[PDB]
Amino acid sequence: MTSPRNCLRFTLLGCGSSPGVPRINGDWGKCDPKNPKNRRRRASLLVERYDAEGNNTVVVIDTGPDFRMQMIDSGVHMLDAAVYTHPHADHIHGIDDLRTYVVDNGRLMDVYANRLTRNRLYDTFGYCFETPVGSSYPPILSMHDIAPETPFSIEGAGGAIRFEPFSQVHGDIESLGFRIGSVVYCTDVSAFPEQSLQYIKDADVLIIGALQYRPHPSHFSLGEALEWIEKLSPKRAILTHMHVPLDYETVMRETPHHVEPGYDGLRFEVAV
Amino acid sequence: MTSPRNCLRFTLLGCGSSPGVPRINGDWGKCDPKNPKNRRRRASLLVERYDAEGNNTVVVIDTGPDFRMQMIDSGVHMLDAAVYTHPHADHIHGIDDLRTYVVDNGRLMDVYANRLTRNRLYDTFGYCFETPVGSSYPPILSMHDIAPETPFSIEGAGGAIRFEPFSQVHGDIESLGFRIGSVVYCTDVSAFPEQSLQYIKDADVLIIGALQYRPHPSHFSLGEALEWIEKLSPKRAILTHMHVPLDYETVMRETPHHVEPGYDGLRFEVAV
Ligand SMILES: Nc1ncnc2c1ncn2[C@@H]1O[C@H](COP(=O)(O)O)[C@@H](O)[C@H]1O
Ligand SMILES: Nc1ncnc2c1ncn2[C@@H]1O[C@H](COP(=O)(O)O)[C@@H](O)[C@H]1O
Ligand SMILES: [K+]
Ligand SMILES: [K+]
Ligand SMILES: [Mn+2]
Ligand SMILES: [Mn+2]
Ligand SMILES: [Mn+2]
Ligand SMILES: [Mn+2]
């Protein structure tokens, strides 16, 4: 058997900070421009469940500006739902590209967001939900609420994928993290509230944001992320949302064996 | 002399329709997937003026979702201004990526838009103009009005670039086209008003949208674009905003010698 079966499969679609690596002006920072692993798209995760016959349920976490190229390069040509962490540009400005799937599926695309995120999507992308005055474009999205500490499930051809959302502090706003089975996704986080600890401890894989070496008001530094990894004892940790000071080979050396920097297209399967 | 001097230089950053080619679901339509010229980013044009010493003024027309990769691949690492045609997703959803230049230039990025476009950018990207409640992010953009039949000039290190905007019908809304010297850029157009004809006739290069073979309410078909090219007698025409029915090699054969389909990265210099 040479295709995925009886598993969850995770693909790190993007592992960069908000301006990407390099920045738009060609700035690679301290990254080796010759290592393709240092070319970073904006942060996003693809989550799939495969059954015994290889049928799949497919869910994306965040639709940033790189969403179209991320999906094309993933090789996965269908989508059941999108789930959002928070309403920052690098996580939402690719939303229009969900249109194609609406035509393929013959129904509105199910999207999942908390109230803060939803209310900002309605402000800035209202035409995706309701046809405005002077337009003939039908809406393309169907909104579902999510909230910390309330699990939700997304159905599809591979069976249901159950998400456990939890609260994160992200500078001056809240973002969501998610546990999916044994795998935890924590991007855009500067502190973990006490009530969220149960969701983040004892993960088989912890995917955790580490922006740079120096402190930043909205994200963990590398040292802060490593302190959390030591406390939470994941079997493996993968760093994400990495900015131009963090070079792949350098960070690989500086971190424990069970910890690695992410790279775009990083893919693994786990039991379900 | 092996770098540009004493010229205008134009780069077709993107030549695709709104979902790109291929679509996000991997659909190439009738395009040969093996020809790299058929991989199309969303429509945008880079305009540069170089002086005798190779100093440049750099202006982008539209900042769609592909804007960051377009600029990186262009090799041009600075920007003086952005000019907008109309407020559709494929032309504006990359706007946040102007942030990097604001830091480099030490001043807000000058953006140019008509009232319709400006009012939609304020709705959907207000935080780029004014810090909202609960935020510490400074604004990044400085807005300037443009209107059909009123020329405007953008200053920079290579000298001024003079734009002549004009009205286009684009289905149920108006879009702007621009003449820059001898070069005319007409994307997202389904009809030309009589008063715009003076700007589009007798171009050295006419860059004109041709979506597909079949009629569409918002864009010229290939046949309609060719009818206009015959009436307007440009020396050379380049087709843009091309959707998945239009294969590069096929359209090259079907069109007169002085007419060609565009491709991403297409670049030419003209006298100033
Ligand atoms: N009010 C806002 N709405 C959406 N995006 C914002 C807002 N304010 C700032 N941003 C952008 O959100 C991103 C913040 O990046 P991060 O450091 O990854 O939390 C940057 O792309 C900012 O330019
Ligand atoms: N009210 C709106 N604001 C912004 N973009 C829109 C709106 N309505 C539709 N669109 C998108 O704008 C694009 C229209 O594409 P075009 O066929 O190139 O004119 C598509 O990406 C649409 O999903
Ligand atoms: K390591
Ligand atoms: K031809
Ligand atoms: Mn972010
Ligand atoms: Mn953020
Ligand atoms: Mn368009
Ligand atoms: Mn349009």
Residue numbers in the entry:
A (entry chain A), B (entry chain A): 1 to 272
Lines from the paper:
Here, we report the high-resolution structure of BrabA.11339.a, a structural genomics target that entered the pipeline as a ‘β-lactamase-like protein’. β-Lactamases break down β-lactam antibiotics such as penicillin and lead to the resistance of pathogens to antibiotics. BrabA.11339.a assumes a metallo-β-lactamase-like fold with two central β-sheets. It therefore seems likely that BrabA.11339.a is a GTP/ATP or GDP/ADP hydrolase.
For both long-wavelength data sets and the Se-edge data set strong anomalous Fourier peaks can be observed for the two active-site metals. Each of the peaks is about four times as strong as the signal for potassium. Therefore, the dinuclear center of BrabA.11339.a can be assigned as two manganese ions with a high degree of confidence. In order to confirm the binding of nucleotides, crystals were grown in the presence of GMPPNP and AMPPNP. In both cases, however, very solid electron density could be observed for GMP and AMP, respectively. The γ-­phosphate groups of GMPPNP or AMPPNP, which had been added during crystal growth and had been supplemented for a short soak in the cryobuffer, are nonhydrolyzable; the β-phosphate groups, however, can be hydrolyzed. It can be assumed that BrabA.11339.a is able to hydrolyze AMPPNP and GMPPNP between the α-phosphate and the β-phosphate to AMP or GMP, respectively.
